[PDB]
Amino acid sequence: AFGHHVQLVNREGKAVGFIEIKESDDEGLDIHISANSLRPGASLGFHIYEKGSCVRPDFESAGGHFNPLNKEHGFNNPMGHHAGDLPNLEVGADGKVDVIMNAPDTSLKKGSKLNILDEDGSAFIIHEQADDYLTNPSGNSGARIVCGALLG
Amino acid sequence: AFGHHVQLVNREGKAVGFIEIKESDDEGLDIHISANSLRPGASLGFHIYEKGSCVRPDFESAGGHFNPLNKEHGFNNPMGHHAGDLPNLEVGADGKVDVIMNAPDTSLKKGSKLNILDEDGSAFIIHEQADDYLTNPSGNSGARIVCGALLG
Amino acid sequence: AFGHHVQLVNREGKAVGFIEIKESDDEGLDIHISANSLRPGASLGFHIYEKGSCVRPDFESAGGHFNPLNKEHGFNNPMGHHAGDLPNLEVGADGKVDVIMNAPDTSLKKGSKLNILDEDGSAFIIHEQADDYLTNPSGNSGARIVCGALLG
Amino acid sequence: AFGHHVQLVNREGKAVGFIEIKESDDEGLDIHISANSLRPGASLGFHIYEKGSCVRPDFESAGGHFNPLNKEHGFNNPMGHHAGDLPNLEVGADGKVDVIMNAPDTSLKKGSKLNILDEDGSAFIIHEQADDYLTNPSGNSGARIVCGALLG
Ligand SMILES: [Cu+2]
Ligand SMILES: [Cu+2]
Ligand SMILES: [Cu+2]
Ligand SMILES: [Cu+2]
Ligand SMILES: [Zn+2]
Ligand SMILES: [Zn+2]
Ligand SMILES: [Zn+2]
Ligand SMILES: [Zn+2]
Ligand SMILES: [Zn+2]
Ligand SMILES: [Zn+2]
Ligand SMILES: [Zn+2]
Ligand SMILES: [Zn+2]
Ligand SMILES: [Zn+2]
Ligand SMILES: [Zn+2]
């Protein structure tokens, strides 16, 4: 079943949705994301970050696209991509995204290099603009505008 | 000799000093930093960022402490220190600073993994408060307040 | 309406955009500046000069930051500032700028001492680096690199 | 007694003579100027500038015909004349000039609004061309080709 429930908040502190995760067969992780209050009909950057910490308004604090394999950013970079690089969100007329994405190169298993429930935890962040799938170190996705932490 | 001159600007895009660089002997790089308009008497964090970009007001734009070898932040971190972690700057009653720091784990020579003059460039950033040499991603140094871009 | 169209050239005489001006409510002058071929990512200084003449290559040729009340240079100078001093321009990764700056101490009205549309005209200039908002004659902005003449 | 000795250099850094100054009787200042390496037979622009600073090649850097009384440039302009406006140099077959000029509207006195030995200092500059005694801001004299600074 889906578990590991994570509340999403915006820069102003508003609850705007949740994520749940499932230990996918197979393999990697299925991510149920169900959010509101987004730019209606935008393409938006979406990634797993390396530190479970969402301090507003900016969320720099903390990190880092999740990158246990030390690669460059981008599905279409020949030197890419990071393990927490996911495909863009496609927001409805509503301002909602309600989908399930696969994250092949992640895990919940302690010990494993692909673990996102490590000591640090990890963060899911929505960006202001699209990931261009190519530029270092975050696809030119702009400001981090929603955040949720999974605690480690 | 020192060269590769970088201008420093604050969050208002005012000129606040400069930086020059020497291919050290020995080793890494020597970084001459001569800055004004700063908090009088402050210790302020100081690091090389992974992209040669300085967009006001808050400089997230862009990146990233420069991290070729994928470690954590901090001189006092066992898992640590990013190749762009430099020691804290000490500001006089003056508002000013004028030192030469050594950055041993950097290079200017094209194609070295430690190369800070890559296609991307690098940025020198001064923070609003002192680094603790330990916490991820930036040592709780706070806001980015001065940025100078090394381009190409 | 914005009117009084001015073409901008570089040190080579190449066209690099334009300028338009609105009698601002309120008040003073609104200044629409749209430019290209500039150093990507740079803060560049930007000032209204006192004569409407742009002779290649260095634009000396004339003058003069526009200084009808005979002050010193600098937003940050207690003995400032010239009527022609404006805030620095920020250039995109693009090499471009496209902004409206407000110039509160200028006028288009014949006879007003703050008149930029006088019998010898005024020039709009971009410099090679950022104004410190302090030093005389021009805030250590470096060479004049782009000029357009407003000829009243 | 002449004193306050200043070394004259050209745009290329060659020593090309000197100026000395006497607290005139009366009034203002007598200026002994003795220069070489100049265009033989030319009538040339010669002025006291408001900042003691001679940066080569161009001497823009710094300022300003010296102007404590907020006047326009030119003996023959009726809105006329800068305190540092002087008569044109008349170069001999030599390429040499060796004269004493009177500057009636200046002074060495530290309490004086006419003081040229102020905090800032003044520059004496020779122009590439003749001053037309009429036009703003420097009488159509062209490039600044020789500069000597009096420090403040
Ligand atoms: Cu991202
Ligand atoms: Cu930092
Ligand atoms: Cu200027
Ligand atoms: Cu002159
Ligand atoms: Zn990434
Ligand atoms: Zn982690
Ligand atoms: Zn670091
Ligand atoms: Zn120094
Ligand atoms: Zn880089
Ligand atoms: Zn100015
Ligand atoms: Zn525009
Ligand atoms: Zn004018
Ligand atoms: Zn004059
Ligand atoms: Zn002075």
Curated annotation (Swiss-Prot), chains A, B, C, D:
The entry's keywords: Cell membrane, Copper, Disulfide bond, Lipoprotein, Membrane, Metal-binding, Palmitate, Signal, Zinc
GO terms classed as biological process: removal of superoxide radicals
GO cellular component: plasma membrane
The record's free-text note on cofactor binding: Binds 1 zinc ion per homodimer. The zinc ion is bound between 2 subunits and mediates dimerization.
Positions with a binding annotation for Cu cation: H47, H127
Known cofactor(s): Zn(2+)
MF terms in GO: copper ion binding; identical protein binding; superoxide dismutase activity; zinc ion binding
Disulfide bonds: C54-C147
Membrane topology: Lipid-anchor
UniProt protein name: Superoxide dismutase-like protein YojM
Localisation: Cell membrane
Residues that coordinate or bind Zn(2+): H32, D98
Main location: membrane
Parent sequence residues shown: 40 to 191 of 196
Family: Belongs to the Cu-Zn superoxide dismutase family.
